[PDB]
Amino acid sequence: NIPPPFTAPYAPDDAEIAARLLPASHLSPPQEARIHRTATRLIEAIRKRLGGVEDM
């Protein structure tokens, strides 16, 4: 069934949202270790260093 015209509360309370997002963000230590490594490698590649607007 086609959904009704979109209408969600415009500006709900940040805290109530954070109260659900904070626990669901939890990751296991091997999951965090993999993220840490991938991100480190991506950032180090960026720091190798003509570049971009931010550099100018």
Partner: protein, 57 residues
Amino acid sequence: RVIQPGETPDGTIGRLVKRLGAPAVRTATRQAMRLMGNHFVLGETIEQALERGKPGQ
């Protein structure tokens, strides 16, 4: 030597690598190489330095 992976980054170079990343450290080393080669007249002995810094000029 053979360098085992996952070595805890200690020392002046290790701490630099942790802060900047290994590739930037490599880039900074090459720049230091240009600076040492261009702005300094150096040798193991004075005769070697003096020979290096030679210019009928």
